[PDB]
């Protein structure tokens, strides 16, 4: 997807919650810097529901889509207060923009 | 020689369906123009929307209410106070062309009952009945809360909508949702983090963080957090009142309570000043887009 226009729902969609760069600070969401690889929960010194832990799966570009669609749906008991990417090409173009900075 | 009554009478030939199909259009719109005021939706405007034309009404004389659907007069399209609301009757536009049928009443309340359900909130019962009026109905300009003022104000003012403080504090919960705009109101800033979901962040933010009123770049005060959260004065004078705290802290605890009492406050609200016969149906309970599987 896009990797201009990702950055642009990352800003108006995620800025609120999340951080990317590297040792970003924590916010109602988790820094979300180097996600891809490891699994769901990860602390790192931040407080999760079990909810996520519960659905121990990795984090691949391909399960993050069915995540992003509906966040209740994929995981039942998060805390994300998200609506989700009801487009398939914003999903393609939220997740190439987070495959830079989280690294 | 008597003061107004406003009797409900349903659209001939509409049913169920009838109206859960405008509920369908309306909510599929909300999917597609997802990029209004930097990708929040029409929804949070959708039920400021249903909020200003019902919150005209007056229990002493029974004038204005969602039921005459007086806003596509401009005597009412031209309020300060409705600055920004031009957006949320253009987003209904093409809906009432589409079902011709519908009244203006019907229709802008059945625009807030569904943007909350569609944002994860509290499914509203909803009903119909309301039919339009002549121009001569149309509310003066003012009949709208004052955004910078304090507790007294914000008791004394619903009363004249006929609720009690346990009803407002649940409709505050409303303000948790879009932000405010400076060429519209003059308040500049979000009221919390999740601006397009329907979720209990009001009451939290209002005890979990601090607040400090600064002045903002139009000369209005507001109260402002160090995460970026805004709030107004009459707003923020719900932590000051210990009668309307000690109903942010449950509402802040038990979110399911919230949920349940904004839906019944909510309801009443659009509700007013419309008496219903008993041959009317019952209330209709819509299904959101998830339950049909979209
Ligand atoms: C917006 C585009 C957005 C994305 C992308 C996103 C991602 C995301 C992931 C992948 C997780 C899981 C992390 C893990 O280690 O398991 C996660 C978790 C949380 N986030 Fe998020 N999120 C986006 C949006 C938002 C928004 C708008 C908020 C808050 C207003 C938010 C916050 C949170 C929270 C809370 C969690 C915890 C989930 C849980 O504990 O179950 N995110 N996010
Ligand atoms: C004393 C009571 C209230 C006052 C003074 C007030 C005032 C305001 C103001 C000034 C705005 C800014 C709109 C803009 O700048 O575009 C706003 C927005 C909003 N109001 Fe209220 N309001 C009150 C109560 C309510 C109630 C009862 C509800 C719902 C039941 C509600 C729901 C909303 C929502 C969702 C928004 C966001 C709209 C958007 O972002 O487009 N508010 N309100």
Redesign the pocket.
Same mark, same amino acid.
């Given at each position: 997807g896009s990797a201009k226009k990702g950055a642009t729902?990352?800003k108006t969609?995620?800025l609120?919650?999340?951080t990317v760069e590297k040792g970003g600070p924590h916010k109602?969401?988790?820094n979300?810097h180097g996600?891809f690889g490891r699994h769901?929960?990860?602390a790192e010194g931040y407080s999760?529901?079990d %909810?996520?832990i519960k659905k121990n799966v990795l984090?691949d570009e391909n399960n993050?889509s069915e995540?992003?669609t509906n966040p209740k749906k994929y995981?039942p008991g998060?805390?994300? %207060?998200?609506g989700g990417?009801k487009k398939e090409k914003d999903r393609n173009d939220?997740i190439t923009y987070?495959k830079k900075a989280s690294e | 020689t008597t003061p107004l009554v406003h009797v409900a009478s349903v659209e001939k030939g509409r049913s169920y369906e009838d109206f859960q199909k405008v509920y369908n259009a309306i909510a599929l719109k909300l999917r597609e123009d997802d990029e209004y005021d930097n990708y929040i939706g029409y929804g949070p405007v959708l039920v400021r929307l249903a909020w200003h034309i019902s919150g005209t009404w007056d229990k002493h004389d029974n004038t204005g209410g969602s039921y005459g659907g007086t806003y596509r007069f401009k005597k009412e399209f031209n309020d300060p106070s409705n600055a920004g609301l031009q957006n949320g009757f253009k987003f209904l536009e093409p809906i009432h062309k589409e079902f011709p049928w519908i009244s203006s009443g019907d229709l802008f309340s059945l625009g807030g009952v569904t943007a909350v359900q569609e944002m994860q909130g509290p499914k509203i019962p909803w009903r119909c009945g309301r039919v339009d009026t002549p121009e001569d109905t149309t509310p003066d300009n003012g009949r709208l809360p004052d955004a910078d003022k304090d507790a007294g104000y914000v008791r004394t003012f619903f009363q004249r909508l006929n609720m009690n403080d346990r009803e407002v504090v649940a409709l505050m919960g409303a303000h948790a949702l879009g932000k405010t705009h400076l060429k519209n109101s003059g308040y500049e800033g979000p009221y919390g983090? %999740?601006n397009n979901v329907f979720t209990n962040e009001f009451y939290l933010n209002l005890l979990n963080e601090d607040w400090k009123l600064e002045k903002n770049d139009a000369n209005n005060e507001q109260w402002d957090s160090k995460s970026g959260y805004m709030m107004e004065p009459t707003d923020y004078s719900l932590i000051q009142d210990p009668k309307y705290l000690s109903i942010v802290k449950e509402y802040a605890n038990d979110q399911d309570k919230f949920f349940k009492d904004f839906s019944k406050a909510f309801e009443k609200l659009l509700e007013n000043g419309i008496t219903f016969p008993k041959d009317a149906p019952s209330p209709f309970i819509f299904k959101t887009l998830e339950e049909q599987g979209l």
């Open positions: 729902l990352f969609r995620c609120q919650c999340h109602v969401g988790p979300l996600i769901s929960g990860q999760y529901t %909810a996520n984090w993050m995540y992003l995981i998060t805390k994300m %207060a998200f990417l939220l987070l | 983090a %999740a």
